[PDB]
Design an enzyme around this catalytic site. Structure first.
Site, PDB file in Angstrom:
ATOM      1  N   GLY A   1       0.834  -1.189   0.000  1.00  0.00           N
ATOM      2  CA  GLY A   1       0.000   0.000   0.000  1.00  0.00           C
ATOM      3  C   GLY A   1       0.869   1.239   0.000  1.00  0.00           C
TER       4      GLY A   1
ATOM      5  CG  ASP B   1       6.594  -7.449  -2.523  1.00  0.00           C
ATOM      6  OD1 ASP B   1       6.407  -8.634  -2.172  1.00  0.00           O
ATOM      7  OD2 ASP B   1       5.895  -6.500  -2.104  1.00  0.00           O
TER       8      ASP B   1
ATOM      9  CG  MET C   1      12.153  -1.547  13.564  1.00  0.00           C
ATOM     10  SD  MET C   1      12.402   0.187  13.130  1.00  0.00           S
ATOM     11  CE  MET C   1      10.907   0.929  13.812  1.00  0.00           C
TER      12      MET C   1
ATOM     13  CB  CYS D   1      21.091   6.888   9.658  1.00  0.00           C
ATOM     14  SG  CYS D   1      21.635   5.959  11.105  1.00  0.00           S
TER      15      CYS D   1
ATOM     16  CB  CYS E   1      -1.936  -1.270  20.341  1.00  0.00           C
ATOM     17  SG  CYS E   1      -3.452  -1.783  21.189  1.00  0.00           S
TER      18      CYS E   1
ATOM     19  CB  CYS F   1      24.542   6.523  15.524  1.00  0.00           C
ATOM     20  SG  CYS F   1      23.520   5.363  14.556  1.00  0.00           S
TER      21      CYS F   1
END
Ligand SMILES: [Zn+2]
Ligand SMILES: [Zn+2]
Lengths: 244, 231
Positions: free
Chosen positions: A38, A59, A129, A169, A184, A240
């Site tokens: 989407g 994909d 993520m 980043c 949730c 980082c």
């Protein structure tokens, strides 16, 4: 270029900020889109029609009925057919004068690396993520921009990260790697919301490739419910695991 | 609502703000999309996949090569076919389970008023200041909500005008384009329709303006003009 191509790209070429120059730049540019759902679907649709020279669609999933409500590129007849293919295929029918590659895999390791490398800009359209993390890592490493976004329910989040790595980043705003606490309502999502997000990822890719003064380093937030936009400033981690 | 239906609308149903209550509402709604261009094209696409019960696709015109850059619902292969027909066909392939009525004609006067009447929400997706003006008139006559937009170059414009007509009508107020900029506006037009048809609260008395170059939104407070020829 051509006198026909002129007609097709007429609406962009007629624009001061793009004109014939940028239009060529777009045609000479390459873009990697990891994830065609989407988010990546309307991203790819608009880039092709804009004339982005090359488009690599990655994909590893098939077309499921569950998708048709927000992944506008697909049709019911495409069910159970691999996304990357179906995608490239339909985008072709839209702009044949452009090359479209279809990776029916999961970009990772070196396969993701060099893939990123080339690309003048990389859109992250995986609502994941982890993936997003290495896409970021890879992007930072092979100094290639990353335009990541996401959506859950009525909420959208977009972010443009340029090579100079000024404001850090994604592994700065989230040196972590697990998940956010929006875990949730991760139930559903409104089409227009995830849609507007991806569509914007493309507007950002165009402006980047056609060298336009597009602000970056922000974290734009969209509230589909209140129909309100919001921006959070960014700045890198004083050391980082990346961008250091 | 069978297994198939539950499956397609599942990402909308599992949403607190919609659930079966709203999905059912959408499925009982009719939306008039006047104009199937850079705006209307994505709008119709998002509404259909959403499952709006009935969609009236109005548009008196054929596809052109020029179009393919912002009008994502068409391909080069439909280049001379009429849009309302091509839209109607492509949209059906996406959701055969909804009412899709094409309109290869051009609505005006009565032909328009009828369509506006038989319609919960009307999307003004005709980048023509004229048609726009007639619709606003019809929408206020038949107290039917109007979601209208515009998009030029890098800047878009959006407006949600509703029945109480509290902050004005479109009269009370009054050639190159980037792909994504019209898109955002159109997609947002759908978002507002879905929020209007499902029953979600939506500040609407404003004129949202988008500057796609600077990447920032701005709003202007609408006000129903003194003695407006409609309000
Ligand atoms: Zn960093
Ligand atoms: Zn008025």
């Amino acid at each position: 270029m051509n006198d026909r191509d002129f007609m097709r790209y007429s609406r962009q070429i007629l624009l001061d900020d793009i004109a014939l120059d940028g239009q060529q730049k777009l045609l000479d540019s390459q873009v990697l889109i990891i994830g065609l759902g989407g988010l990546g679907t309307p991203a790819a649709l608009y880039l092709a029609g804009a004339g982005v020279g090359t488009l690599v669609l990655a994909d590893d999933d098939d077309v499921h009925l569950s998708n048709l409500q927000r992944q506008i590129l697909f049709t019911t007849e495409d069910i159970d057919r691999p996304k990357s293919q179906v995608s490239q295929q339909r985008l072709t029918q839209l702009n044949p004068d452009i090359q479209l590659t279809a990776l029916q895999q999961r970009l990772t390791g070196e396969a993701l690396k060099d893939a990123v490398a080339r690309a003048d800009v990389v859109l992250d359209c995986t609502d994941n993520m982890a993936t997003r993390q290495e896409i970021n890592a890879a992007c930072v490493a092979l100094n290639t921009p990353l335009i990541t976004a996401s959506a859950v329910g009525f909420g959208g989040q977009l972010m443009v990260l340029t090579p100079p790595w000024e404001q850090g980043c994604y592994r700065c705003l989230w040196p972590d790697n697990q998940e956010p606490e929006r875990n949730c309502r991760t139930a559903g999502v409104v089409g227009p919301v995830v849609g507007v997000m991806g569509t914007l990822q493309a507007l950002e890719a165009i402006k980047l490739l056609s060298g336009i003064e597009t602000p970056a380093g922000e974290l734009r937030l969209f509230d589909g419910k209140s129909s309100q936009w919001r921006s959070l400033a960014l700045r890198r981690a004083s050391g980082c695991p990346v961008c250091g």
